Design a protein around this nucleic acid. Structure first.
Length: 579
DNA sequence: CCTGACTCG
DNA sequence: TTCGAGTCAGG
């Protein structure tokens, strides 16, 4: 039972200086999406307002934009961005229930108020999916029903604020919420709304040339196979490779023969077709995802793409990026890398500026493990891959070949991801006996790291969770499973999450610090993207000199570790050229 | 819808 | 039998 006022005009008591606020955007992608209703709960009552009314009411808009009028919300970024597309500013958000729930336990996958309410046994609100339905049945219900849902969500936020803040504090996560994630949410809202401009003429031309090349590679594959088939079908491909051409079966999955890139690479001594097939699938992914998929989400009038950074999704503390994902744009092979030529500045005589942390996960490892030998390598800035090579190959620096260094690189990151000798041998296509020795030698060379890996798994067993530098947590209830596979997965998460998660913490704080500096110096430069360990900005060309100093300094100084942090940077006329 | 394959950190 | 994401085509 819950009384509320279904209001048809705004009143003074609706504008109190503390309220739970709901600004409901039901489309998953909130860019330029309709606002279907509004609810306010405060000391004076519970109210529902129509958007057309309240959003045209100068007093309500003033209240929204007034920083001293504090609002508690769930997913404030969604409301903030949807409001931006209507030219309205939302300020004063002092508590975000989505982010609070996310910090308390990312595993719960909270993405509606009812799901957060569940964490505190609060049942006086329905799941969104219950009210709106799913798939083709999805629809906004009749006003009375909508109104009650929005009011119940606001009522829930109102009552849940203190219980959530109280638990965050005993978890040592209250500052993580209010000083890191909540400020970052506003910064991400700005980035999403600004968007990134795309050179569609260039993308469309690339797509036309790619179609041509696909056709050619395709026919060559059929010629080598002696038959036509669907190359994009791992099932049909498997019949061609392992039945028709009788190539060895190196791996099976639950569904059948594996045709993974790793397997096809290993088959190259048997038949040249596998190299053609790998190329074809590369080209096809470029076409389908980064040409076609990208062109579908460009807003035709402004030629911008507006990603959504999911801030409350990953288990480690990272962001993700969707519709489109701008955190997986090709870079490692030159053919794919050219896609980046189509990401351009939003203004004339602006440039793209890209700054990345060098080896942040390995530096975080050095810090947390307190390994003398690894800390000293970074403190002296020795090449960490060449150093590991000297140890795992047992040679002097002058004897380290480029291939040995590449193998050591694989050992250095593999350790951070819990690699076994099997995985390392498969990765490097080397002897498993050898791979096991690489690992044995690594741990003899970096005994602090070995101790850290043992200790963190013990900590996980004892506490039930692991923590990052800035007190993010991930629970690991499988860490004591009797099942080898299940327990092993949890142990590798114990090892890896504090590293990936602490690196996430660091770059998040850098974004907040950087944004502060940019505004302080009245620079026009602004953030466009974050890609886990790098930040991409655009700015008028005049500001490059300043950014060359400002951006890396702010990023290097974000946190102080037991080793230095290092940032590299580049700028140019497109994302491609900022290299 | 899931699986597996390509993409990034 | 190396971690964490999103999108795509095929089935």
């Amino acid at each position: 039972k819950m009384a509320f006022t279904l209001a048809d005009r705004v009143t003074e008591e609706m504008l109190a200086d503390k309220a739970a606020l709901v600004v409901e955007v039901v489309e998953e992608n909130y860019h330029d999406a309709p606002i279907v209703g509004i609810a306010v709960v405060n000391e004076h009552g519970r109210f529902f307002l129509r958007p057309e009314t309240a959003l045209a009411d100068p007093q309500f808009v003033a209240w929204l934009g007034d920083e001293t009028k504090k609002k508690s919300m769930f997913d404030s970024k969604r409301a903030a961005v949807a409001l931006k597309w209507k030219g309205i500013e939302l300020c004063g958000v002092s508590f975000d229930l989505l982010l609070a729930a996310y910090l308390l336990d990312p595993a719960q996958g909270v993405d509606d108020v009812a799901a957060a309410a569940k964490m505190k046994q609060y049942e006086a609100v329905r799941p969104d999916e219950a009210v709106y339905g799913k798939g083709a049945k999805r629809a906004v219900p009749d006003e009375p029903v909508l109104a009650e849902h929005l009011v119940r969500k606001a009522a829930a936020i109102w009552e849940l604020e203190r219980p959530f803040l109280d638990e965050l504090r005993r978890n040592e996560q209250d500052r993580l919420l209010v000083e890191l994630e909540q400020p970052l949410s506003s910064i991400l809202a700005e980035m999403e709304f600004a968007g990134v401009k795309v050179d569609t003429k260039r993308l469309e031309q690339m797509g036309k040339e790619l179609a041509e090349q696909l056709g050619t590679v395709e026919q060559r594959i059929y010629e080598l196979a002696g038959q036509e088939f669907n190359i994009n079908s791992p099932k049909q491909l498997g019949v061609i490779l392992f039945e028709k051409l009788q190539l060895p079966v190196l791996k099976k999955t639950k569904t059948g023969y594996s045709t993974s890139a790793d397997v096809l690479e290993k088959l190259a001594p048997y038949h040249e077709i596998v190299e053609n097939i790998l190329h074809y699938r590369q080209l096809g992914k470029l076409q389908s995802t980064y040409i076609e998929g990208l062109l579908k989400v460009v807003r035709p009038a402004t030629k911008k793409v507006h990603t959504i950074f999911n801030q409350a999704l990953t288990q480690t503390g990272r962001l993700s990026s969707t519709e489109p994902n701008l955190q997986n744009i090709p870079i490692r092979l030159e053919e794919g890398r050219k896609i980046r030529q189509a990401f351009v500045p939003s203004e004339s005589d602006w440039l793209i500026f890209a700054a990345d942390y060098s080896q942040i996960e390995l530096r975080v490892l050095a810090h947390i493990a307190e390994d003398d030998n690894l800390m000293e390598a970074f403190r002296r800035d020795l090449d960490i891959h060449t150093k590991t090579a000297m140890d795992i190959f047992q040679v002097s620096e002058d004897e380290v070949t480029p291939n040995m260094r590449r193998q050591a690189k694989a050992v250095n990151y593999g350790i951070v991801y819990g690699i076994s000798d099997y995985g390392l041998a498969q990765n490097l296509n080397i002897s498993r006996k050898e791979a096991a020795e690489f690992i044995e030698r690594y741990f003899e060379s970096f005994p602090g790291v070995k101790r850290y890996m043992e200790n963190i798994v013990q900590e996980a067993k004892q506490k039930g969770y692991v923590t990052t530098l800035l007190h993010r947590r991930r629970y690991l209830p499988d860490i004591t499973s009797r099942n080898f596979n299940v327990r092993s997965f949890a142990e590798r998460m114990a090892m890896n999450t504090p590293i990936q998660g602490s690196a996430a913490d660091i770059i998040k704080k850098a974004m907040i610090d950087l944004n502060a500096r940019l505004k302080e110096e009245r620079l026009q430069a602004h953030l466009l993207l974050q890609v886990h360990d790098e930040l991409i900005l655009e700015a008028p060309k005049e500001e490059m000199e300043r950014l060359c100093r400002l951006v890396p300094e702010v990023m290097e100084q974000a946190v102080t570790l037991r080793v230095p942090l290092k940032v590299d940077y580049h700028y140019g006329s497109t994302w491609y050229d900022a290299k």
